[PDB]
Scaffold this active site. Structure first.
Site, PDB file in Angstrom:
ATOM      1  N   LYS A  76      78.336  32.942  38.324  1.00  0.00           N
ATOM      2  CA  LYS A  76      76.818  32.912  38.566  1.00  0.00           C
ATOM      3  C   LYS A  76      76.469  31.655  39.486  1.00  0.00           C
ATOM      4  O   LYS A  76      75.870  32.083  40.480  1.00  0.00           O
ATOM      5  CB  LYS A  76      76.175  32.922  37.209  1.00  0.00           C
ATOM      6  CG  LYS A  76      76.258  33.985  36.163  1.00  0.00           C
ATOM      7  CD  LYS A  76      75.324  34.214  35.107  1.00  0.00           C
ATOM      8  CE  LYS A  76      75.363  33.022  34.059  1.00  0.00           C
ATOM      9  NZ  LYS A  76      76.738  33.299  33.337  1.00  0.00           N
ATOM     10  N   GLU A  93      72.456  23.574  32.135  1.00  0.00           N
ATOM     11  CA  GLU A  93      73.875  23.879  32.595  1.00  0.00           C
ATOM     12  C   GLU A  93      74.380  22.315  32.568  1.00  0.00           C
ATOM     13  O   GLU A  93      73.990  21.574  31.851  1.00  0.00           O
ATOM     14  CB  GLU A  93      73.444  24.384  33.923  1.00  0.00           C
ATOM     15  CG  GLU A  93      73.099  23.235  34.722  1.00  0.00           C
ATOM     16  CD  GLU A  93      73.045  23.783  36.580  1.00  0.00           C
ATOM     17  OE1 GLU A  93      73.768  24.825  36.717  1.00  0.00           O
ATOM     18  OE2 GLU A  93      72.612  22.988  37.234  1.00  0.00           O
ATOM     19  N   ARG A  94      75.829  22.547  33.012  1.00  0.00           N
ATOM     20  CA  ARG A  94      76.554  21.249  33.067  1.00  0.00           C
ATOM     21  C   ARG A  94      76.243  20.298  34.003  1.00  0.00           C
ATOM     22  O   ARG A  94      75.787  20.538  35.132  1.00  0.00           O
ATOM     23  CB  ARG A  94      77.986  22.065  33.066  1.00  0.00           C
ATOM     24  CG  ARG A  94      78.578  23.007  32.051  1.00  0.00           C
ATOM     25  CD  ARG A  94      79.562  23.457  33.043  1.00  0.00           C
ATOM     26  NE  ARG A  94      80.174  24.698  31.953  1.00  0.00           N
ATOM     27  CZ  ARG A  94      79.241  25.630  31.496  1.00  0.00           C
ATOM     28  NH1 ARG A  94      78.141  25.961  31.703  1.00  0.00           N
ATOM     29  NH2 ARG A  94      80.063  26.595  30.687  1.00  0.00           N
TER      30      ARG A  94
HETATM   31  N1  LIG Z   1      84.750  33.769  44.026  1.00  0.00           N
HETATM   32  C1  LIG Z   1      85.439  33.200  42.812  1.00  0.00           C
HETATM   33  N2  LIG Z   1      86.776  33.696  42.702  1.00  0.00           N
HETATM   34  C2  LIG Z   1      87.544  33.545  41.735  1.00  0.00           C
HETATM   35  N3  LIG Z   1      86.922  33.098  40.570  1.00  0.00           N
HETATM   36  C3  LIG Z   1      85.721  32.640  40.727  1.00  0.00           C
HETATM   37  C4  LIG Z   1      84.902  32.837  41.662  1.00  0.00           C
HETATM   38  N4  LIG Z   1      83.653  32.498  41.421  1.00  0.00           N
HETATM   39  C5  LIG Z   1      83.684  31.940  40.132  1.00  0.00           C
HETATM   40  N5  LIG Z   1      84.843  31.951  39.678  1.00  0.00           N
HETATM   41  C6  LIG Z   1      84.578  31.517  38.393  1.00  0.00           C
HETATM   42  O1  LIG Z   1      83.281  31.629  37.758  1.00  0.00           O
HETATM   43  C7  LIG Z   1      83.330  30.496  36.888  1.00  0.00           C
HETATM   44  C8  LIG Z   1      81.941  29.986  37.024  1.00  0.00           C
HETATM   45  O2  LIG Z   1      81.380  30.348  35.903  1.00  0.00           O
HETATM   46  P1  LIG Z   1      79.575  29.702  36.062  1.00  0.00           P
HETATM   47  O3  LIG Z   1      78.915  30.873  36.831  1.00  0.00           O
HETATM   48  O4  LIG Z   1      79.611  28.401  36.760  1.00  0.00           O
HETATM   49  O5  LIG Z   1      79.173  29.627  34.603  1.00  0.00           O
HETATM   50  P2  LIG Z   1      78.998  30.898  33.376  1.00  0.00           P
HETATM   51  O6  LIG Z   1      80.421  30.998  32.679  1.00  0.00           O
HETATM   52  O7  LIG Z   1      78.112  30.510  32.444  1.00  0.00           O
HETATM   53  O8  LIG Z   1      78.977  32.190  34.100  1.00  0.00           O
HETATM   54  C9  LIG Z   1      84.700  29.527  37.478  1.00  0.00           C
HETATM   55  O9  LIG Z   1      85.797  29.714  36.279  1.00  0.00           O
HETATM   56  C10 LIG Z   1      85.106  30.063  38.412  1.00  0.00           C
HETATM   57  O10 LIG Z   1      86.565  29.619  38.483  1.00  0.00           O
END
Ligand SMILES: Nc1ncnc2c1ncn2[C@@H]1O[C@H](COP(=O)(O)OP(=O)(O)O)[C@@H](O)[C@H]1O
Ligand SMILES: Nc1ncnc2c1ncn2[C@@H]1O[C@H](COP(=O)(O)OP(=O)(O)OP(=O)(O)O)[C@@H](O)[C@H]1O
Lengths: 52, 479, 507, 40, 49
Positions: free
Chosen positions: B155, B181-182
């Site tokens: 997200k 959020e963090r």
């Molecule tokens: N393009 C991407 N390719 C591979 N892994 C991804 C990608 N985008 C995010 N991830 C993963 O999404 C996760 C980030 O989650 P985030 O949206 O920050 O919070 P939430 O867990 O609440 O959705 C990370 O573990 C990150 O490694």
């Protein structure tokens, strides 16, 4: 040598600790004896509270 | 100024007694005799010149009979071009350690929405450089956008990509609001915006700073902050954006992270405020507390606010009341999935749950509409063959079904594309795919020009030409 | 120091001179008291009764005050006098805690000596903000293979260890603790040593004693401390112990040093908070918990952080532990902590009994930090390893039906089986990073594909002994440079070739 | 039954289309020489 | 060798602290004398080799 000095410092500390501990225990016991023995301390404490 | 006396203290709730001139509801009170600044927001009137308030900071260290001063207005945040480039709290205080906000004006975070008579504008198309987005769920320039998903789906990463691909090119302003959020994420966003020119901090010899330029504003109500702060930081950022909308007539962008925390931080205090619980554990005042926000988030005849809200979906259950009530409030929708993210298909958008008010033949032409609907039909057919494949096998399928399955699989691989923000995860460089290119490639794939090309080449390709380049390469290393 | 007669007696004589609020208990029940009086109490402060027992004031109602007691309520008698000390609940900090076992409030229970610490710290504190932080770039060597390769952990992270009962949660944490004694013995740089804190909530004293024994048997107590808030220990102590651990760890985080903290049975904290609020007549939420559970865990986990070069450069990593029921992670507490953590390490019984120990599911298990908390030498191998294991996990289910497959897929199955048999480990048998690198090199370059799966468990040990005896220099070079140059690549390959020559296995 | 069916389906499809992609990679450059860098 | 030349000399104890922090100061003196008598011969052998 450093470990020796740490040990001797700790020993001195525990010595002085136990010393003051017993100095208090014994002063307290001495007062608990002298109060119950002497009649004067009772009225002295009465007057002390009154003036306090 | 009135004067009141704290009467009891329960968590984030503070009951206060005044001798005269009770304050209205939502007004702001300042505690006197405390270590740091402590602000209370009125929420109820209980009688006997008593009120009940919600604290912005922790109640640890508070005493009964401590004194309180009413301000005569709700939490007023400073506004102007002086908040730009700068980080601010819910109460307007800065937490960037660069000085105080020299703003010549302040707005109350509690305002009334624009009425029905203040209409929207044309459904402008927004180009993000993302393929599935630009194709199946086109984003509106003046309407709300939703990113629904659980934990671990991308997200805030998607929001960062949208910021890179929209805000820098945008001539108007932009606002970010972090709601529970963090803090690592907040630091990363601030550092990346200082890097990429979205923020322009210039320190001076006299110890001051200069944020000239810096077409972005940031607001943070993060996890460490209590409820009342997590709740009102969204209102704070929305007032900061309403300033640019109403007066400066600017076009504005508005990113929000974990809006779900708003509702959570309501439910954390409702039962202390004496409300009966609703269903599974949220509060009764969910839909109204959300609508008073969303209706303030709208385009008018003075400006426009394009908003993008990330919606946590606990346990991947879209039947939860908060998302259920939030789907009705959005122009564009984008639902992320784990069954898809497990396949390495990033962005992990479900094109059978993603929708948009914009996807109509009159707005986007029939070349776009029919392409999108053909893609969706193909993907639904592939989903309606999963069990037949799992039970019998590919041996039973006709060549029509094989061709349809191959096209659906190829389309799924084609949709996934690398992101610059994900480079520190994937290492691959990022891509920006324009919409006519996406439509050409989808029309081609559906027409059958590229069925012969292998699926692997299709995967992780920004454009069809790139797919050709990778297929050429794979054939060369194949011989 | 000073001498007794001329100095100490004079001091006490100067000390004795003195002359010239309080409340009374009104209701008592279930480890909780309700007082009338003490109008000048800080919400959250320490309170003292007339029998030595202590308490903490939480509910500052209008008429009465709600105190929670640190012990049994047999001492309180509905009328006892009560006095406030004015201190917010706080605990000592320092290196005097290292090697010691203490309760939730810093009072020792080892039975050997008091706590020599002069500086205290408040239990509930404000986490550090956005500016005094930086990104996570240093790794935390866990000693395991699947963790250090596929779910890496940095210094400043907050990674959850979630699973069922009897799956290897404490064992994972104990191996993480045990792997650090070499790193600490082979230096005197406190910026590089890793200190450890083990908070045990709800555990039994037999288990805590077994853990202390396992650590003393391996000299893994001179850099650890333990905080035991067991089941007999009251609800407020179980609820307060992890905040005390974070307070003890912020000394390291702020003083330029590093630290790791393991909260064990973090669900017993929420159980105790439910108990307290329900005996304080606070209204519940779902699963009878309150709504402040998110603000109960966020306060706690936001104290883990990686500070900047101006605040010393310290770190406090966190490794909370959670027991689910029937693998239900759709619940409330697992959901909250997953939504507020930087990763996950799932543990399963199907994998624990199939033969995979540790039973880490590397699909659900993640680490948002990822490669940034990983050495380059380990990146090189672990990328390929993750790819191969993804393919194997995809294909093996269809493969197990007895079909006949090509060689390009048989190679996938062979390599996946080899890696799955490599990543198994005995309990309390952690390994260095260089040795993990060497083993996974042997596994990735194909020196285990033809070999039998059942023979890898001794291939691994024999190769370890071989490289520790005759090829320690490769290990030292990898430990220093933290990469694999072509020279080290060739030397390692030659060593593996010598080993396979010198030895013989079933294939 | 759920993960069972899903993983069986995924593995079967992966194998099938791996074979088909291998064949197509064999027979691509002949029928599409305009991409072949041998002639460029 | 590497071990005993990496830190160099971080120990370098300072008797000003311990003479104050200790009250006996009767065996500490002889101990310090022993220390400086061994350190003299150590530096002697070092400069001799
Ligand atoms: N393009 C991407 N390719 C591979 N892994 C991804 C990608 N985008 C995010 N991830 C993963 O999404 C996760 C980030 O989650 P985030 O949206 O920050 O919070 P939430 O867990 O609440 O959705 C990370 O573990 C990150 O490694
Ligand atoms: N690698 C391993 N190899 C063999 N046995 C293991 C391994 N890991 C864990 N075990 C067993 O797991 C059991 C539980 O250990 P642990 O202290 O982690 O309990 P837990 O998982 O926290 O659950 P609970 O606290 O409710 O008892 C132990 O009896 C241990 O023998």
């Amino acid at each position: 040598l450093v470990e020796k000095l740490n040990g001797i410092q700790q020993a001195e500390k525990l010595i002085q600790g136990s010393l003051q501990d017993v100095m208090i225990r014994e002063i307290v016991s001495s007062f608990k004896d002298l109060y119950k023995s002497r009649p004067e301390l009772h009225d002295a404490a009465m007057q002390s509270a009154i003036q306090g | 100024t009135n004067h009141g006396r704290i009467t009891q203290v329960i968590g984030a709730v503070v009951d206060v007694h005044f001798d005269e001139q009770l304050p209205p509801i939502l007004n702001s009170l300042e505690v006197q005799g405390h270590t740091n600044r402590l602000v209370l927001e009125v929420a109820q009137h209980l009688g006997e010149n008593t009120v009940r308030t919600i604290a912005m900071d922790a109640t640890e260290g508070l005493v009964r009979g401590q004194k309180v001063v009413d301000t005569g207005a709700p939490i007023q945040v400073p506004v102007g071009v002086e908040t730009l480039g700068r980080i601010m709290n819910v109460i307007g205080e800065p937490v960037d350690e660069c000085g105080p906000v020299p703003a010549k004006k302040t707005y109350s975070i509690h305002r009334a929405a624009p009425l029905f008579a203040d209409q929207s504008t044309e459904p402008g198309l927004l180009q993000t450089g993302i393929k599935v987005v630009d194709l199946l769920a086109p984003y509106a320039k003046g309407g709300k956008i939703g990113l629904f998903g659980g934990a671990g789906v991308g997200k805030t990463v998607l929001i960062m990509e949208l910021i890179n691909n929209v805000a820098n090119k945008h001539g108007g302003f932009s606002v970010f609001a972090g709601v529970g959020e963090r803090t690592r994420e907040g630091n990363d966003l601030y550092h990346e915006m200082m890097t990429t020119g979205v923020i322009k901090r210039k320190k001076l010899e006299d110890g001051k700073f200069d944020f000239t330029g810096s077409k972005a504003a940031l607001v943070y109500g993060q996890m460490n902050e209590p409820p009342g702060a997590r709740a009102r930081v969204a209102l704070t950022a929305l007032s900061v954006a309403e300033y640019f909308r109403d007066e400066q007539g600017q076009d504005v962008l508005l990113f929000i992270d974990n809006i779900y925390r708003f509702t959570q931080a309501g439910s954390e205090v409702s039962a202390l405020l004496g409300r009966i619980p609703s269903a599974v554990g949220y509060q009764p005042t969910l839909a109204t507390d959300l609508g008073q926000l969303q209706e303030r988030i709208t385009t008018t005849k003075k400006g426009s606010i394009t908003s993008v809200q990330a919606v946590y979906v606990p346990a991947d259950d879209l039947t939860d009341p908060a998302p259920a009530t939030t789907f009705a409030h959005l122009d564009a929708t984008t639902v992320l999935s784990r069954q898809i993210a497990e396949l390495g298909i990033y962005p992990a958008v479900d094109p059978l749950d993603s929708t948009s008010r914009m996807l109509a033949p009159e707005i986007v032409g029939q070349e776009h509409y029919d392409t999108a609907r053909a893609t969706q039909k193909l993907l639904q057919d592939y989903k309606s063959l999963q069990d037949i494949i799992a039970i019998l096998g590919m041996d039973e399928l006709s060549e029509e079904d094989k061709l349809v399955v191959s096209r659906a699989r190829k389309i799924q691989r084609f949709l996934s594309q690398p992101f610059t923000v994900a480079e520190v995860f994937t290492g691959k460089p990022g891509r920006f795919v324009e919409l006519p290119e996406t439509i050409k490639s989808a029309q081609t794939i559906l027409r059958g020009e590229c069925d012969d090309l292998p699926e692997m080449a299709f995967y992780m390709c920004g454009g069809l030409e790139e797919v050709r380049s990778k297929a050429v390469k794979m054939a060369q290393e194949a011989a | 120091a000073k001498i007794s007669p001329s100095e100490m007696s004079r001091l006490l004589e100067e000390r004795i001179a003195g002359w010239k609020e309080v409340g009374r208990v009104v209701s008592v029940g279930d480890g909780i008291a309700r007082l009338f009086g003490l109008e000048g109490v800080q919400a959250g402060e320490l309170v003292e009764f007339q029998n030595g027992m202590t308490g903490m004031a939480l509910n500052l109602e209008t008429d009465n005050v709600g105190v929670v007691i640190f012990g049994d309520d047999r001492s309180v008698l509905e009328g006892d006098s009560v006095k406030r000390t004015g201190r917010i609940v706080d605990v000592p900090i320092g290196p005097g805690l290292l090697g010691r076992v203490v309760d939730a409030l810093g009072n020792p229970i080892d039975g050997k000596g008091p706590i020599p610490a002069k500086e205290r710290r408040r239990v509930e504190l404000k986490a550090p903000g956005i500016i005094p932080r930086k990104s996570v770039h240093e790794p935390m060597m866990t000693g395991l293979k699947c963790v250090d390769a596929l779910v890496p952990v940095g210094r400043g992270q907050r990674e959850l260890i979630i699973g069922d009962r009897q799956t290897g949660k404490t064992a994972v944490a104990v191996d993480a603790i045990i792997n650090q004694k070499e790193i600490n013995d082979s230096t005197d740089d406190e910026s590089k040593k890793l200190y450890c804190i083990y908070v045990a909530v709800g555990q039994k004293r037999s288990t805590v004693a077994q853990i202390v024994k396992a650590l003393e048997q391996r000299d893994a107590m001179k850099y650890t401390t333990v905080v035991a808030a067991t089941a007999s220990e009251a609800a407020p102590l179980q609820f307060l112990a992890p905040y005390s651990g974070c307070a003890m760890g912020e000394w390291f985080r702020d003083s330029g040093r590093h630290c790791v903290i393991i909260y064990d049975d973090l669900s017993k904290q929420a159980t105790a908070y439910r108990q307290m609020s329900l005996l304080l007549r606070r209204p519940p939420g779902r699963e009878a918990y309150p709504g402040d559970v998110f603000y109960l865990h966020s306060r706690l986990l936001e104290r883990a952080a990686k500070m900047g070069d101006k605040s010393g450069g310290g770190s406090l990593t966190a490794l909370p532990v959670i027991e689910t029921q029937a693998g239900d992670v759709s619940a409330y507490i697992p959901t909250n902590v997953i939504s507020i953590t930087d990763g996950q390490i799932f543990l399963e019984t199907e994998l624990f009994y199939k033969g995979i120990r540790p039973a880490i599911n590397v699909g659900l298990s993640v680490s948002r930090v990822g490669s940034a908390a990983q050495v380059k030498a380990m990146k090189q191998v672990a990328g390929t390893m993750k790819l191969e294991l993804a393919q194997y996990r995809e294909v093996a289910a269809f493969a197990q039906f007895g079909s006949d497959l090509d060689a390009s897929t048989r190679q996938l199955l062979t390599r996946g089986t080899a890696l799955t048999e490599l990543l198994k480990q005995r309990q309390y048998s952690p390994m260095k990073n260089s040795v993990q690198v060497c083993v996974l090199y042997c596994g990735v370059k194909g020196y285990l594909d033809p070999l039998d799966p059942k023979e890898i468990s001794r291939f691994e040990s024999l190769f370890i002994d071989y490289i520790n005896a005759n090829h320690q220099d490769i290990l030292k070079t990898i430990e220093t440079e933290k990469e694999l140059s072509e020279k080290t690549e060739a030397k390692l390959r030659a060593a593996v070739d010598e080993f396979v020559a010198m030895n013989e296995f079933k294939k | 039954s759920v993960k069972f069916m899903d993983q069986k389906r995924s593995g079967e499809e992966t194998v099938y289309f791996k074979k088909e992609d291998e064949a197509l990679l064999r027979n691509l450059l002949a029928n599409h020489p305009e991409y072949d860098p041998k002639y460029s | 060798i590497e071990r005993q030349s990496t830190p160099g000399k971080p120990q370098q104890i300072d008797w000003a602290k311990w003479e104050s922090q200790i009250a006996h100061k009767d065996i500490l003196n002889c101990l310090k004398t022993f220390y400086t008598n061994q350190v003299q011969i150590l530096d002697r052998a070092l400069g001799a080799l």
